[PDB]
Design a protein around this ligand. Sequence first.
Ligand code: SF4
Lengths: 102, 112
Amino acid sequence: QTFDSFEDLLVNSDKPVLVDYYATWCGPSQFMVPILNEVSETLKDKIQVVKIDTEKYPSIANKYKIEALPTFILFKDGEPCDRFEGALTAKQLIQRIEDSLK
Amino acid sequence: EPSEKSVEIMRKFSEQYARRSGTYFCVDKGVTSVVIKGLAEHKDSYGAPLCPCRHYDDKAAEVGQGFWNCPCVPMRERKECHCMLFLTPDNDFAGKDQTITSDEIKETTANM
Ligand code: SF4
């Protein structure tokens, strides 16, 4: 994974891309990993999920002006269409994704 | 890994600050524990417990500025804690504990 490979993923995806910008020692971020993994399965045919370690790829975090962690950005056609910070439940997460889609 | 001495310092700090601010730990004490270890890791790396739930352009510089050294300015100003370390009692994720034991931290961060 790299700044360029991530950008190319966004430009080529045939589905909306949900990106989780995370850090290892962030408690809310770690809390969201299993929840996001459950949601990724529930929404397997609607979205692609990508996780970006902001401490290992700060160039990507800087491009998106990431502040609080975790940050989630939902992209459509290579373009951010929604963004939120912090922990949320699986139900909230599915509802937010489905919202921004319609 | 953060040193045990730093973790214990940050654990006791968190209990004291929760009591002094009227805030409560998360119902999932694995969130509490990871944050305390992240605070301890930053204290070991940079010399102050820079907030671990944030992206920085330059962590060392930000430690020098001070805004995000725990307890950060938003927590001191309005009890806003993005780390979910200190929760107000009306928060959906708040429990009623202002105690986090060493065993809770060890059990929830063992794989880290
Ligand atoms: S958000 Fe502020 S008060 Fe909460 S853990 Fe991070 S630095 Fe400490």
